[PDB]
Every structure is written in structure tokens, then in C-alpha cells.
Amino acid sequence: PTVKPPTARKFIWTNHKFNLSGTPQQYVPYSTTRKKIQEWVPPSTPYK
């Protein structure tokens, strides 16, 4: 990369991180979607 540098981008990591597994910086998976079914919210006023 000193002779032929990589083509720069605004989104490439300027700080390369090594393998973070076993550290508190490790990856934890999760569902990246929102909630599908919406529940009914009962009225906060009395019914009499």
C-alpha cells in the first residue's frame, strides 16, 4: 500500500480494530427489525 495505495472512501475505518472476541467490545447479535404486531393500549380513564 505504500506503492499502490487503496482507494480512499469516507466510510472506511480509519482505525483498524483487531479481533475483539472475549473483550467487552465483542459482538452481541440482535434482531435488527422493529416490532411487528402492535398491542392495544387500554384507556387510562375510568369506565363508569
Partner 1 sequence: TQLITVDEKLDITTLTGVPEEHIKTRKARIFVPARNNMQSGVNNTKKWKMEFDTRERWENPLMGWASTADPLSNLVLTFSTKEDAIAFAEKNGWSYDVEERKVPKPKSKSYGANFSWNKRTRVSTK
Partner 2 sequence: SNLIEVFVDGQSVMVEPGTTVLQACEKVGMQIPRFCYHERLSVAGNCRMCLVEIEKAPKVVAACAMPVMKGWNILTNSEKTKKAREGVMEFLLANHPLDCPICDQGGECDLQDQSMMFGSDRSRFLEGKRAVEDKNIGPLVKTIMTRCIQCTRCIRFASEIAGVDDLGTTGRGNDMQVGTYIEKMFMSELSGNIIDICPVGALTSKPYAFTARPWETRKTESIDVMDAVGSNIVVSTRTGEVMRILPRMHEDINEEWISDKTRFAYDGLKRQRLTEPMVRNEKGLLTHTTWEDALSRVAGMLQSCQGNDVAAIAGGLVDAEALIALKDLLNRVDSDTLCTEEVFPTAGAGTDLRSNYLLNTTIAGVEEADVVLLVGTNPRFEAPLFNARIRKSWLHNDLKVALIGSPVDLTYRYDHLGDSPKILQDIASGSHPFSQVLQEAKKPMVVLGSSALQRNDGAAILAAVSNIAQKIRTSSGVTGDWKVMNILHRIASQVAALDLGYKPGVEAIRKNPPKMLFLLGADGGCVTRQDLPKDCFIVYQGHHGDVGAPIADVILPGAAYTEKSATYVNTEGRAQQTKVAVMPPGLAREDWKIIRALSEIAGMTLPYDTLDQVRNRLEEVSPNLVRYDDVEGANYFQQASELSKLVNQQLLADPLVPPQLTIKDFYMTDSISRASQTMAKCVKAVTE
Partner 3 sequence: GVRTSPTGEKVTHTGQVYDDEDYRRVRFVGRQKEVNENFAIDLIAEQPVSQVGSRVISCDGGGGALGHPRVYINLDKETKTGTCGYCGLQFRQQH
Task: Output DSSP code: residue 25.
Answer: T
14 binds partner 3 (CB under 8 A): no
If one asks whether residue 34 binds partner 3 (CB under 8 A), the answer comes out as yes
Q: Nearer to partner 2 by C-beta: 1 or 29?
A: 29
Closest alpha carbon to 15 in 25, 23, 24, 30: 25
Residue 39 in grid coordinates: 398491542
Residues 7-36 that bind partner 2 (CB under 8 A): 36
Residues within the interface to partner 3 (CB under 8 A): 10-11, 24-28, 30-34
